[PDB]
Amino acid sequence: FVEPKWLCKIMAQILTVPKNYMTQYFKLLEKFQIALVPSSLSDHRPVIELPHCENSEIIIRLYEMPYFPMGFWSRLINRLLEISPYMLALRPNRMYWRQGIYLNWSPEAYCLVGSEVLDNHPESFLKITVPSCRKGCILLGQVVDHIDSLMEEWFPGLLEIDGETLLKKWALYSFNDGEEHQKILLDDLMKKAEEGDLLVNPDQPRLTIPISQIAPDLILA
Amino acid sequence: PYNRMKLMIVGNTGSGKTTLLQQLMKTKSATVGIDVKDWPIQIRDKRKRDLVLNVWDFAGREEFYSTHPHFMTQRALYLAVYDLSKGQAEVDAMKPWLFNIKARASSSPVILVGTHLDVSKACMSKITKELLNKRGFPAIRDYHFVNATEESDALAKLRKTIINESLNFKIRDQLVVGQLIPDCYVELEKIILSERKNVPIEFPVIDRKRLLQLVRENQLQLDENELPHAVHFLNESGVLLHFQDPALQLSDLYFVEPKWLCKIMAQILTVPKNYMTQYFKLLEKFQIALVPSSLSDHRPVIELPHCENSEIIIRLYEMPYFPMGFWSRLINRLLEISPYMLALRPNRMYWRQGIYLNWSPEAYCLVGSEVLDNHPESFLKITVPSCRKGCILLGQVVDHIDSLMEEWFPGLLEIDGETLLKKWALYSFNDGEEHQKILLDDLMKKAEEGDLLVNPDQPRLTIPISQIAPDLILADLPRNIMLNNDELEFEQAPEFLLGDGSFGSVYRAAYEGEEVAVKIFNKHTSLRLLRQELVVLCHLHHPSLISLLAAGIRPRMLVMELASKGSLDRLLQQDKASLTRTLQHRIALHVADGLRYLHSAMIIYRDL
Ligand SMILES: Nc1nc2c(ncn2[C@@H]2O[C@H](COP(=O)(O)OP(=O)(O)O)[C@@H](O)[C@H]2O)c(=O)[nH]1
């Protein structure tokens, strides 16, 4: 491509609205994350009455960054596009929107990567709701790998220590048997540093939760 | 004679409604709720029939709409105002109001009224004389182009026309404004209007015990059994609102001054701790509760797993416009009330125009609006997988939708006659690989029950009627139950083979080498009651219950096991000697076992 201003103008043309290379046209259009158009996707989360509630049967993993990166979500969505199957075949139900994906195989084999805002917090989050089953843990592993890959490959500035790192990965757990609420949050690096045992315990040692049901990518589950 | 008829001012936002009302009554800010009033009319003719029209100035704003169909009754005269200032367009913009009147109160007269004559476009009279006359619409009986905010001869003629059309209501020659009622009814009416004053303005509700003390204190001779029918008639007349159904706890609370109730319920849309539980219950009874309205109106992109045409089932539903408050009722009706199995919670993605439950990649369901190009109508596409569990979901959903239509909006089923509601089915004789799914009306396919297949002009290709409409052919139930008519030995005509006297229409026939009892459910009715009894009897499987063998469509019949010795009634009458102590106890034990299993399934065998 010579005179790149022409290329970039022509590629940005179709956003506000040579038949030989039309296939290459669409290929590079996908290489620009334009193709279905990921942008202009109504910006509105649809209400999702998930089957499983409680705290015991699910796994959360927040991702705290001040603002979402410039072109993050399109890259992520286009990366998770059928590239994370629970098994090693079947097409999963998908509900795309500009801030989430929510694949769905079965009532116990789903996955939902979607933005979420918390009150009194000007930061941004990337809540990842995943069932506690085995296939759940598999999906969680694949998704965390793909996201960390995008971060290390596209936006390096959000990983290098200065130093709050500008990107803090949390994990959500409930020592209150799941029936109660207000899931306590634990930074990921600390739990990684708690590999000495295979359990986590609060000040009151009577209650104890395995590190497999909070982070099955750290413990090899 | 009872001189009281409901007047209802429907209309579109921004028009003249509350001011038009305030000028008809001469009782010299947006509307929230419905603003119930009542103005009396002293007839100046010799027959001075003093009547009271209670007006219901419906608010035009779109967010309230899902509560509007609840207060549209048959015994009512509807005004409809359409703001002539924005001429030639608002007349078309008030078509949904007319269609919803026709959907709810089919045979109620309507009086078009054109406000804003002060400014400007009177050629809207042309379109309202050609387009809005008789195109599946609720029989417009007059036009009026009147100013508001200023009494005039146009206002005078308009008001006189309201009164004239009021008296000449006569549904099937009834003369509603002058029908006869028992004295106790009008007595109860008077004591309610007096009790309107002596009640907390902040909480105008009254108690059934307080009502009982009221009717005891006065000369009302109404009995306890005579109360429900009485207060129900008062409800129809728009005096006090009540809901005697036991599903709600409101059968002890009688709402007086209904304008307060409706305003308070519509309050929370634009944004007494003892009855907060009943508050939420009736809030659900108003389809407010999660709030079904204000749900972003935007379909989310759904990349369904299965494409093609062979592995899926579509079923369009064509109506000109969606009814007034349809979608809220439907969503709230399908709320977890259609499980694939007889346990598991399905994934759901609610939005104002769809539900899309989801169990498994082959066990989903999606009921959602869809527009087609070059088609100003509306559609209710229902995508369902071709698997067995799919067909089960399809059956339940069609039943629930048809139930809503027959129970809420009767005007969309009665033939005139295009029926204003045409159910399609989508099929592809091109092996599914190709496209442009041909559409076939449902009534036509129902008439094609003679065979079990459908075939085009080219007879080489042929598609079963089970994979296009598994509710017509009895495949939506589990455990396919067709009777394999080759092996049946039934003769319907003779009274020689009746089961016995007074068993309905149960005949005695031989099937699969065994004598069986078959009920001919065939009549003018549809497959509704047949399938209803079929899903009940589909999964019981108990010894003390009559076991089902097969069901049929040509003609509609139910094939069940045959009781050789006849009913117990005959043995009690004819042969009292056959019954001994041990036999009587065994009969009692078996019936008790049957009732136990039934109540374990939470089923009420009402009569025994
Ligand atoms: N000049 C003029 N104004 C009108 C006429 N009819 C209604 N309006 C205006 O419309 C307003 C009333 O709107 P309203 O019916 O209450 O709206 P709604 O409550 O949503 O039905 C008043 O403020 C009037 O000024 C009319 O014939 N002429």
Numbering used by the authors:
A (entry chain B): 1597 to 1613, 1642 to 1659, 1668 to 1720, 1726 to 1799, 1804 to 1862
B (entry chain A): 1331 to 1358, 1366 to 1457, 1463 to 1613, 1642 to 1659, 1668 to 1720, 1726 to 1799, 1804 to 1995
Quote from the publication.
Leucine-rich repeat kinase 2 (LRRK2) is a highly pursued drug target for Parkinson’s disease (PD), which is the second most common neurodegenerative disease projected to affect 17.5 million people by 20401. LRRK2 is a 286-kDa protein containing seven domains (ARM, ANK, LRR, ROC, COR, KIN, and WD40) with kinase and GTPase activities. Autosomal dominant LRRK2 mutations with higher kinase activity are leading genetic causes of both familial and sporadic late-onset PD cases. Here we report high-resolution cryo-EM structures of LRRK2 in complex with a panel of small molecules, including two type I (LRRK2-IN-1 and GNE-7915) and three type II inhibitors (rebastinib, ponatinib, and GZD-824).
Following a similar purification approach, type II inhibitors were mixed with full-length LRRK2 protein in an ATP-free buffer before cryo-EM analysis. Both LRRK2 monomer and dimer exist in the same grid, and we were able to resolve LRRK2–ponatinib, LRRK2–GZD-824, LRRK2–rebastinib complexes at nominal overall resolutions of 3.4, 3.6, and 3.7 Å, respectively. GZD-824 and ponatinib are analogous compounds and bind to LRRK2 in a similar manner. Specifically, the main chains of A1950 and D2017 and the side chain of E1920 form polar interactions with nitrogen and oxygen atoms in all three small molecules. Our structures show that Ala2016 directly interacts with all three type II inhibitors tested here, with its side chain pointing towards the inhibitors, but not ATP. The binding of type II inhibitors resulted in the structural re-arrangement of the ATP-binding site. Furthermore, rebastinib, ponatinib, and GZD-824 occupy the position that was otherwise taken by the alpha helix of the activation segment. Tyr2018 in the “DYG” motif rotates and interacts with type II inhibitors, and Lys1906 and Glu1920 form a salt bridge. Additionally, the αC helix moves towards the ATP-binding site and interacts with the small molecules. The LRRK2–GZD824, LRRK2–rebastinib, and LRRK2–ponatinib complexes provide structural templates for designing LRRK2-specific type II inhibitors.
